Amino acid sequence: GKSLLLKVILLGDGGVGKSSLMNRYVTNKFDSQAFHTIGVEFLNRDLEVDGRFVTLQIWDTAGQERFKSLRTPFYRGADCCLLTFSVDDRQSFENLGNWQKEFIYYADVKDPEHFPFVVLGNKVDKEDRQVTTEEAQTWCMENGDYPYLETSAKDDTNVTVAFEEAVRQVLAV
Ligand SMILES: Nc1nc2c(ncn2[C@@H]2O[C@H](COP(=O)(O)OP(=O)(O)NP(=O)(O)O)[C@@H](O)[C@H]2O)c(=O)[nH]1
Ligand SMILES: [Mg+2]
């Protein structure tokens, strides 16, 4: 019959790698000189998870605060939220709780305690990390027991796994 259509939405500070993550996963391409997203964009991607056929509709958003008004209307209907930071940007990590809360409010999330969130620490390939695997993981345990993954759009480290996990989190609810 039909594939299961699931809507996942990437949220996180400007520069973290959201569009690079979506574009690495969808078209196996990476741009070193990626330009700020100013609105929203979605790309559909087909996969099989646990021998189950899914269409993942990945919504990309502007991470910058000036474009908040453009992205917030598109949060509603998301089946999962990928809260994204960069391992070389302590502020992006510190802003996770803010992203999480902005999602729950504008997505109109009735049951936030059970809503599927996945946290991605991107840019793991880069040498000077400013945020430790341990503190990232501890935050995720303490703030809802969210699965955490370290990713690199650049090297294609854990990108497929992150998006598969988003699907698994959805199917487990
Ligand atoms: N080293 C490295 N650079 C990455 C990685 N992912 C993205 N980048 C780089 O980081 C910059 C920002 O990427 P981008 O995908 O545009 O980030 P964004 O979160 O979508 N930004 P915005 O919210 O403003 O649209 C680009 O120069 C891109 O090449 C990664 O895994 N590793
Ligand atoms: Mg972008």
Curated annotation (Swiss-Prot):
SUPFAM superfamilies per UniProt: P-loop containing nucleoside triphosphate hydrolases
Annotated GO CC locations: cytosol; late endosome; lysosome; phagocytic vesicle; phagocytic vesicle membrane; plasma membrane; secretory granule membrane
SMART domains the record matches: RAB, RAN, RAS, RHO
Class of enzymatic activity (EC top level): hydrolase
Sites bearing Phosphoserine, chain numbering: 32
Positions that bind GTP: 16-20, 31-32, 34, 36-37, 63, 122-123, 153-154
Family: Belongs to the small GTPase superfamily. Rab family.
Protein name (Swiss-Prot/TrEMBL): Ras-related protein Rab-9B
Provenance organism: Homo sapiens (Human)
